[PDB]
Design a protein around this ligand. Structure first.
Ligand SMILES: NS(=O)(=O)c1nc2ccccc2s1
Ligand SMILES: NS(=O)(=O)c1nc2ccccc2s1
Ligand SMILES: [Zn+2]
Length: 257
């Protein structure tokens, strides 16, 4: 199966998921000079006041914090989006060292990590139907740089010891994802894809310009997770990021001047 090892990493994925060479793959490099301000974009509406987290899972490629998406509670609207998108999970991608880890890049700069808050379009009724549609998902991407600690992240880092290996989960209720946002909601947006197999071309990307700061100690704890299952040879969960893909016939729009 696919992964981020020496023999099953991103350069191999196309053999089982041919869409990997498709026309709207993600992530991409964001060339800040070429991205054009679009005055027709609206402010984002991030409405997480009623978010209900449930569980955290090590799925062998990242850890997902899962939400109750059985009704509209935590939703994303506005910006480039038509309609309402429900938060289903968030996860991160990160590096073996601070100089890499993000999936999107900004003028070729790689950040230490990248947070993805994944939302599905409620007009399709369920998540599984939404991922089959070109406007089925909206992923809010947030860069992480290493500096001061992010207080709102600490509850996540502290549970990681309990989900070290693939297939382990833990209760994770009452977590407020608003504590993972930066101050500004200025963003770039473009049409793309999921960044892990099956790489479906169903995502409207909304990538925030302002990174959040996390401490070295916080990201070091991400790097103690394992890709492998319990009792298997230890493979540290690091460098679980897909590199930038060709932009092809796409424009990246900016919400800001
Ligand atoms: N990256 S993938 O095409 O999905 C894939 N790579 C490999 C390598 C060895 C054994 C099975 C698979 S499946
Ligand atoms: N990493 S991501 O683009 O946020 C993402 N990848 C996938 C793969 C399958 C289904 C949903 C998503 S959301
Ligand atoms: Zn992701």
């Amino acid at each position: 199966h696919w992964g981020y090892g020496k023999h099953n990493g991103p350069e191999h994925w196309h053999k089982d998921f041919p869409i990997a060479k498709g026309e709207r793959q993600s992530p991409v490099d964001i060339d800040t000079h070429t991205a054009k301000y679009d005055p027709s974009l609206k402010p984002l509406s991030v409405s997480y006041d009623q978010a209900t987290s449930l569980r955290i899972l090590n799925n062998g490629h990242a850890f997902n914090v899962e939400f109750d998406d059985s009704q509209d509670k935590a939703v994303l609207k506005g910006g480039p989006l038509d309609g309402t998108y429900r938060l289903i999970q968030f996860h991160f991608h990160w590096g073996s060292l601070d100089g890499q880890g993000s999936e999107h890049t900004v003028d070729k700069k790689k950040y230490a990590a990248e947070l993805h808050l994944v939302h599905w379009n409620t007009k399709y009724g369920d998540y599984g139907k939404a991922v089959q549609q070109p406007d089925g998902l909206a992923v809010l991407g947030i860069f992480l740089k290493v500096g001061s600690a992010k207080p709102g992240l600490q509850k996540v880092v502290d549970v990681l010891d309990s989900i070290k290996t693939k297939g382990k989960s833990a209760d994770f209720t009452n977590f407020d994802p608003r504590g993972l946002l930066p101050e500004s909601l200025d963003y770039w947006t473009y049409p793309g894809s999921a960044t892990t197999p099956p790489l479906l071309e169903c995502v409207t990307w909304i990538v925030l310009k302002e990174p959040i700061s996390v401490s070295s100690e916080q990201v070091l704890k991400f790097r103690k997770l394992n890709f492998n299952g319990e009792g298997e040879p230890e493979e540290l969960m690091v460098d679980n990021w897909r590199p930038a893909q060709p932009l092809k016939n796409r424009q990246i729009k900016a919400s800001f001047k």
